[PDB]
Amino acid sequence: TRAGCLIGAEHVNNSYECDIPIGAGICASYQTSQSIIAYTMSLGAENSVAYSNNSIAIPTNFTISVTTEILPVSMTKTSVDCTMYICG
Amino acid sequence: YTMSLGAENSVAYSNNSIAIPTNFTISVTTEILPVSMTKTSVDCTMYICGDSTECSNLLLQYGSFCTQLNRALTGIAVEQDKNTQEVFAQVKQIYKTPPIKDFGGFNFSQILPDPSKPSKRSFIEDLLFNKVTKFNGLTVLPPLLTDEMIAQYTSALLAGTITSGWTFGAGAALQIPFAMQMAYRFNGIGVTQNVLYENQKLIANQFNSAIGKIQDSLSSTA
Amino acid sequence: LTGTGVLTESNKKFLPFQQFGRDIADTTDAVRDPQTLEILDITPCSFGGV
Amino acid sequence: SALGKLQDVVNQNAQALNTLVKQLSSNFGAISSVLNDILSRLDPPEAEVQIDRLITGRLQSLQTYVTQQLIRAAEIRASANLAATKMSECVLGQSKRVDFCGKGYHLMSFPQSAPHGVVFLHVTYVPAQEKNFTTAPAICHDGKAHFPREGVFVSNGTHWFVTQRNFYEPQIITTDNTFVSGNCDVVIGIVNNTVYDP
Amino acid sequence: QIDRLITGRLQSLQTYVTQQLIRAAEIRASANLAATKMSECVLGQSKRVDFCGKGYHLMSFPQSAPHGVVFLHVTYVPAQEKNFTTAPAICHDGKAHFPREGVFVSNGTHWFVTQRNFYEPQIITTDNTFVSGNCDVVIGIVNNTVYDP
Ligand SMILES: *[C@@H]1O[C@H](CO)[C@@H](O)[C@H](O)[C@H]1NC(C)=O
Ligand SMILES: *[C@@H]1O[C@H](CO)[C@@H](O)[C@H](O)[C@H]1NC(C)=O
Ligand SMILES: *[C@@H]1O[C@H](CO)[C@@H](O)[C@H](O)[C@H]1NC(C)=O
Ligand SMILES: *[C@@H]1O[C@H](CO)[C@@H](O)[C@H](O)[C@H]1NC(C)=O
Ligand SMILES: *[C@@H]1O[C@H](CO)[C@@H](O)[C@H](O)[C@H]1NC(C)=O
Ligand SMILES: *[C@@H]1O[C@H](CO)[C@@H](O)[C@H](O)[C@H]1NC(C)=O
């Protein structure tokens, strides 16, 4: 590989999503009986918007969606004793 | 000498006077921002005790600071990876530019990729990459995303912003001419649409001149 | 001098009076063989994490 | 799977505490970690040196722990400042910042509680299936360029309509939805249509 | 001597790790700032003053850089100005007329209604202004003629 010596997996010429990262684009996964493979991660799909100078796409419907974002606020408060720790 | 803060302007303020502009000029600027660093990892024993037994026996009595520093370096590496993973990887579907360049007046030639070199990058990206310049247990870990993947992500974002405008980051991409997109950009800051639908020529000329000045300044100055 | 590592055949041309060789890190990198005038190169073998 | 950070913080704190407890029972280059046995089996001169070595080792360990705690506290303070900014700019209003509070067009957010953290429920507005149409920059009726006030010009093949560019709502083109800004000589692609008159 | 060397190397490595932690925190802050700028300036148009470019933001184009990112802010700055005489409102039919969206600008002998950030003279009509109140409280209101088409 480009990041080390990988022994125990096969190099498939396909490109799936990166399940377990390895390095320099190499990604492994457990798929089809089944064995560990070593493929190259794909950045996504391949879309080509038909761009014309007289074309406009306006939606005709809408769907409401609710996401979720979790962020920490405070940490744990812990104080120690100098002498009791050092000189017990 | 003594430094001067600037000039001495005196605005003629009056309770019955106002100054409305009559013309406009388009100016393109730049901004540099770092993202990640190099992924390094230093070994404990090979750095402290190089091929020695008594040295390792003495080091084994100093606790487990090696595990602490190894975990710290691993956290630094995974954080530097997550930095670029969150900065660049923000688009779901990789977009692309159409073959026919129907952009009226606008000539995006210095920012679009050029299919002539192995690592496909634009002229500005090539200038930026050309301007920037295992002994005692040291080892540098390779990054997760290579340079070609970052270039492809940037090209996809650029193609999406050029074709769909601001409609590809909130769901499905919607095709729209660049002239109407610029008209909306002008309407978003108060200026009407007839100012652009009649000065498209001057606006495109100023944009091309600004791109030329930017690339000349990037190629000349280091 | 001591050390451990492979001894490859580099192309670093030394001076007629110089014997050792270092780098910007001030470490032994190339030592000339005493018997035959052949400049070698000292690089450690493979090492890393599993 | 969304509770990764809240659990990782506690795991890292527990690992730091366990590492400190383990370092509390190290030799640091001494005969034994227990100090009373050292001072009872050896002479006061050597006992002083052993106690000094143990004190230096434990002080270095405590300083490293304090530095790590300071770094983690700075990171947590930055995260808390970000969370407070998000709460003040998204829950108590409607932000126009793209990809800041939810994926799409922001409508409202609902704050929730969590152990040592906060959970948001961003209600967004996502579009749906699209349809292709033909547009025009302006419309020429009597030699005057008619630019739309708020909306776009959509033609379904035979007739032209005016609608906002966020939903298919075709309306009859009239002079109450457009304004004249000159003649039909500079605008590129201005098509000729019929403007209704009230 | 081996113990002394071990202690010295441990101190050096701890100092190196601390410096690397501080530098990584700084780089993470910079990367978060860059990601926020990318999300709020490239994929849309921002209304924050002096955030993405010096002036009125229109659009941005991202560029790749070694261990970094480079932006191209397309701004919109004004140009040569011109002095005019303004007024708060116009009093024609004994009532005050305030501009709906624009600025009252006089040529010197006549009066027109123009917008801000650009000079485009128009005709003061009933479709450009709205009537509210009488000419008793507005300070600086001048008399003109409100054309009714
Ligand atoms: C409508 O537009 C979409 C997106 O550009 C395209 O995939 C599709 O082929 C178009 N259909 C027609 C009938 O033009
Ligand atoms: C919009 O989508 C919803 C959900 O699929 C559906 O119930 C509704 O009928 C759609 N509106 C249309 C098709 O006008
Ligand atoms: C505005 O400035 C540009 C740049 O010099 C110039 O070409 C144009 O003629 C100016 N506009 C007017 C109305 O003078
Ligand atoms: C765009 O600019 C490049 C470089 O200045 C030039 O080679 C190319 O012909 C230009 N394209 C158009 C359509 O003006
Ligand atoms: C030493 O002897 C060997 C043969 O035994 C010869 O090849 C070599 O050149 C000699 N070295 C010198 C410095 O003469
Ligand atoms: C376009 O819309 C008009 C008015 O709704 C209708 O009369 C006409 O049949 C439509 N044409 C097509 C091709 O759908």
Ligand SMILES: *[C@@H]1O[C@H](CO)[C@@H](O)[C@H](O)[C@H]1NC(C)=O
């Ligand atoms: C759109 O592009 C076509 C090229 O096929 C051209 O004939 C037409 O005039 C263009 N229309 C506008 C409004 O630019």
Ligand SMILES: *[C@@H]1O[C@H](CO)[C@@H](O)[C@H](O)[C@H]1NC(C)=O
């Ligand atoms: C619109 O009308 C004008 C004036 O008669 C004419 O010159 C122009 O060609 C017309 N446009 C089209 C698309 O027929």
Ligand SMILES: *[C@@H]1O[C@H](CO)[C@@H](O)[C@H](O)[C@H]1NC(C)=O
């Ligand atoms: C407006 O008046 C001020 C002072 O009265 C003067 O400095 C300025 O040049 C004038 N502007 C123009 C466009 O003449």
Ligand SMILES: *[C@@H]1O[C@H](CO)[C@@H](O)[C@H](O)[C@H]1NC(C)=O
């Ligand atoms: C505006 O004032 C100038 C004198 O400064 C005069 O020559 C011109 O005719 C006036 N224009 C109108 C429309 O009143």
Ligand SMILES: *[C@@H]1O[C@H](CO)[C@@H](O)[C@H](O)[C@H]1NC(C)=O
């Ligand atoms: C503006 O200021 C002048 C002072 O020179 C004063 O005479 C005039 O009445 C003021 N006008 C208004 C509307 O306040």
Ligand SMILES: *[C@@H]1O[C@H](CO)[C@@H](O)[C@H](O)[C@H]1NC(C)=O
């Ligand atoms: C406007 O008209 C009123 C009544 O005709 C008069 O009292 C006032 O002085 C006039 N103001 C000006 C500036 O001419």
